[PDB]
RNA sequence: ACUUGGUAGUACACUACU
RNA sequence: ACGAGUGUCGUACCAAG
């Protein structure tokens, strides 16, 4: 109701106002106070301001366009000379910034492992291997630094002949589960754990081995370090450009390939083969051969041994005393590891210290990836020892999971490439998969951009190499990979010319064939061979996804990020003086151009919708309560500013920094800084804490800061109530070489930014259902569309401009004049600018957004004032330095030379830095995107003016994401050459970005001819392209370790996503096999392990167990891609249906087969089938057994899983929550929790919702605190800790399985183990009864209810494979008419809200479709007897106990709602864009293409169906009124008449049509019925030939047909072959009253025309010509050839009107000549004759 | 959807469901496979192939034509153009039959004499009887139809419905693995898929 | 510096865009 | 030694003799 008077006096506003010219200040102040609801017109302000700035905008556009004649054609080309100069500059810069070492022994281990082949002669017994190792260690011959220590270690592990005694002692120890037991010179503490015997080793040797060799205690503690002990030096790296270093790296690679390419002497037999070999071999035999060859090599054995040895090292790193050591072994009887004492591995930031030992018969037969310490002679061969290696949990996890990554990489790089050698690929892949250091990340991350920009037409790669590229080469493989990248960059440009376009087959409606030719001419990058363009791009983009996530150390990365932010802020403070400029100064904005462009764009956008404000309010719940918005009630983290001494405070110590030490604290000990010393040492320290969003909302509601008013009013009040904004930051932890800063703010800042972001979002052209962080694959289709359009523009235009030239040249082909003509024809040009902006959010001019708020016509003056006040306050925000960074900087003891952090914080007087111009990461995505689109509109205008200066044709398209930009330009001109145009276009693109305060990134921006690259998506000249491998590799490296089924489901979803992006079937099967194998490895479920379920369920093999019960996925690859994770149940049901259906109904639709289920008997069913059917009936369609305790759970907290392991419940995270204390207070009350349960029981809708007002929201939060899984979502689940959880504690009970409907402690503790869970599940399932009616319910509500499942089942049943075809025209396609396959229209949350509130019209749904959704849900509830069973159970329990149990009824209600939610969610199948070999026009076409594309890798087949797969049903027959059946009849007859005219002989067309009409049916409706509908309608004038041939035509039909002459009646007596390319006979007839014209011509020569009239006078001729040719006839008349004229004749002439609109008239010869000749005398619009007219 | 239309050995109703034969381009229909045409044959005792083709149209169709585009990334477009008087759907079907039947008969020679040779007849009997016992897999009906078509063209449609099944399942493996494979024909992949599937299924059985 | 004993569950970790 | 790094860190911690 009121605005903000404070905005006018704000310092930020005063600075913004005084920086503008006086008229601009007047315009801004008049625009803020403009009221579009009280002015004469809504656009009065925008039009006035647009007119005021029009002259400057026009001058800028014209001046930029006139630069096209000043271009020289010399753009930035990435040729070899420029790359060499950039590389030289890079080498100088890196030599300056790092310490370069040319010596070899400074190399770090490329792989932290050494390996040797196993000995077939020796035994694989642990004790025998231990004895052999002990004998080999003692018999070391020679003298070295640690030889005596190694021999002593061998001595103190000998057992002599007491192997039996050792085994019995170990068994006795392990049976009951310390005092070492003297066996023989060995102090054995456990199996393979020994105690350091002081009598067998010298003290000096022991100190040397444990301090110098292992680093155990060699250092001095932090409290004792002094000034002379701190290390100051630059990071030391190897000379990557040195010749000797490169030769050494090449020698290492050659030796690795020589040793690791041998054969294992075994037979490949593992889980992957035995489970998926049939499918892999069927999809592609070459993939099976490749993986079988991989399994036979030393690479596979080496990496598997390393993974197993790392697992065995981790499993014994828990209880290690300071004077002991351990021996770890693997399946290789020659490779051992010594594990040295360290901290407990499961503690905070703990490491593991190990040393690998290999016994090998011959020297030089050792795999040494730069890790060897020494090879010494011993009895019977040699013993190799590696250096001590210290690793942390993430690096150990990467090592353990490496084999899957190695297999995936090897199979991806070799797919369909006979020119590549498997050994080179395996060598590269083993070196890139076992790398756990930042050395190769620093190369993989920039290699993408470097090679892509070197391959480009034009790019700024030279300056990127010279200034930003910085290899970090600490290992020899880093040097090798640097050389590989250098060679690739050198060869990219001079092999660019080897890419060729495919022949384009276009048909006026679609492009059948397109893309890049697949010829193996390009040179392979990472290993010798030849690749195609697609394989080249895959090699460029694939290694970026090998990299490990989270290799950054907080200690250094926090300082790095703080330094980056503070450097940007200081540079802006001390060097950015002007806000507005006109010469494209960096970090400045052209004021008038910005204002004019914003006005023009706002006028265009707001004119398209008359209810934009209502769309903003309704789409974002502006008038609803704050508790109904998801982003305001989430479990995400927000910031709190206050006094948190008690919460954060968790003997005295003094700081290490001398600048913060009191004179009375010197006589103390130095210690690591914590909250207390930081608080004491900082005067102006502001206190803060991080809480959860929902908890912050609870606290704000409790303290009456937020009320029950609509959220928009609260936001508007908060915009003026909250004036000081505070932010903190943390490191994202991404796989790049440098981390990204992420900013966390307060709740009030969240509300204020939410309002502005939602206002700016509705104008953006982005999809509202997707996120900025996750761009949908729909863009993959959009790109294609654009390209197709542009291709058409390139084909029609050039041809149109070169028709005359081609005709003349051809007549002269059957010479100097020939080339003279050929150089005068218009040439075409294609350009693709793929750009990213540099520092999108950091180096941006925030002030421009001010105008975006002032010029908005959909806001009131008060709203504008409040929003602008919020923005002024936001420009005053303060970033809080994290306490950890302050700890880091307060224990240094040495002043940094040029400390930016100390300077910007006043020598650490405070912890806050003022950040003005940097709007933080992701806060203003939509506003910035809108301004970016305005900039692209300005650039497009400049290009259009420039091209029309050349009298050419142009088509500019621009896709704009947050900062990613893709601009495609198609140009057709005969004036200047193409390089000048390219140079001009790039210069103007850079200048257009600089005009709006943006800046093109020199690292990711490049220019191509035929390669579109939007966000991770490619368009290779009309053909969509995606690097599907990044979905496979990410499925291996990324794992949350939540549980077996959860990990398996996530990996299957990744495989499905890869399939949707064009993954060949064999590789998808390999990915699924690897996912299953890794999930079974992690949770000990392989055949013969602890948790193997095969012998606990009625299943012969793992194919017969549902994947929810740790089985494997048995489903065709067609079902997985289209449904996913519900394909197992569908395939099992289909197999049952085929098995038990009579042979007379075997080849019918799935519906007809299901109708025969009632004739089955339960007695003749296999026990496995009964088991799985019971699971489907009671665990999927019901909630008979709870995976965990459900009290406090909501309707959406029950997945598809059955056995869910428990996770961490961090008490430290929970106690920070304000609402958790309230919950604990209520729990410790006499009758509080029971009253809360009663309140929830009286209002059950709070189980689906979570409170739509203040009181219900608070009660629901307190109730949800009982969930025991909601508490696990608020806690910390470290993937490394959960990784070691499955290794250290494998037999611990973790599963909270609780039967059938209620029948010192570790942080993770369940009730039963996995095997006990299996046993209980079988005991409980057998107690249930399955009946034929139960099977009917299963089939009716898993298959029959969903049209999509019916379609999929029918495709599996009715498919008939056809002819093999070749992939040439891959295209993006969604499912056509998929809205007919949606059983339930709305989202499950909305449907459950409507069901609970019993209200079809809820605050977010359409009341019409929600009624049908509700009736579907009610039918499901009624037919499955869910509510009746719930009532019976409740009544039985109450009668048994005597009094009503609130807990039991609440649990039953929760189960009911969870079952309903799961059923509604199982209906929605998110079938997004698919990449298919051809174009899909129907649902049958889509299904057939998808099915035929997924059976072989080499070719795709044609699939037909015996019957209709999309049988009419409840969503297909229904939802179709009279007009729908009318359209069905129209389509049927339009199809049948032309089918008869095209494929049926002339003498048999009438009989064929009669048979079609009387006997067949179309879309389940009889053809006779359709013919009766069209005869009894008003549209029978559209089927005159049909009525005439049958005989149902009347004179009334003819009168109706010839009575429509009033609107000039246009008919085409014949169809043109191509109306866009102007091919085919033109036979057109236009008729009105007393006038008619008929035109005949072929291609572009109108042969003649006849004009029949009633008054032969020139006036009537001209008026009739204007009235006829001005109709909607579709003939162009300007693409026709110009003809000569003769006196006395009349001609159809065309003339230009709107530079794209034309006028067609009929003129006389003298008229044309006179007007043209007087028009020459003074652009140049002359009357052009086309055709002759006979009057 | 409706009952089949029997005009000679052709089935016009099943022509309606053959989407790859509904091209209006003479070159596309002429250069198809026998697999695309096999779906149209339901002779049921026909000794000739040129009777039902009289029910196909005789109007001129389109044919492809190519043309270079004057652009920096050079490429050639191929479009449709109104064909001559002899480019008819019936003529394209006739040419398809003439080429593809010969190609298939060369691919299933199995003899030093020819396709009709009695040893080849016994081999084809064994091939058809394999699918008579083993449940029809996805890559069998296509071959059955092509064999039937080529027997009709070779004048022994009689010796296709007279096929008598001769079972020891181990014998099949040998007889099949020793069966040679084609290289040039579209059956360079089809017949090998058939052999692989049949041997795998008999191993499972 | 050395010997013995005792203690230790996670990076207490995490944003915007649905 | 190993991890990190042109930011001083990790390289277990505590008590006793
Ligand atoms: N993980 C993220 N969290 C939050 N916002 C993000 C995230 N990633 C991207 N954004 C948003 O998208 C914008 C684009 O970021 P992008 O990754 O393209 O780099 P940039 O910050 O523009 O810098 P540069 O290209 O110079 O590395 C960011 O400025 C930010 O607003
Ligand atoms: Mg960017
Ligand atoms: Mg970007
Ligand atoms: Zn026959």
XYZ file of C-alpha atoms and ligand atoms in Angstrom, chain B residues 43 45 148 157 161, ligand 4:
6
model
C -0.027 -66.499 -52.070
C -0.937 -71.730 -53.665
C 8.513 -69.070 -50.279
C 5.557 -73.286 -55.119
C 3.707 -76.465 -48.690
Zn 2.854 -70.673 -51.792
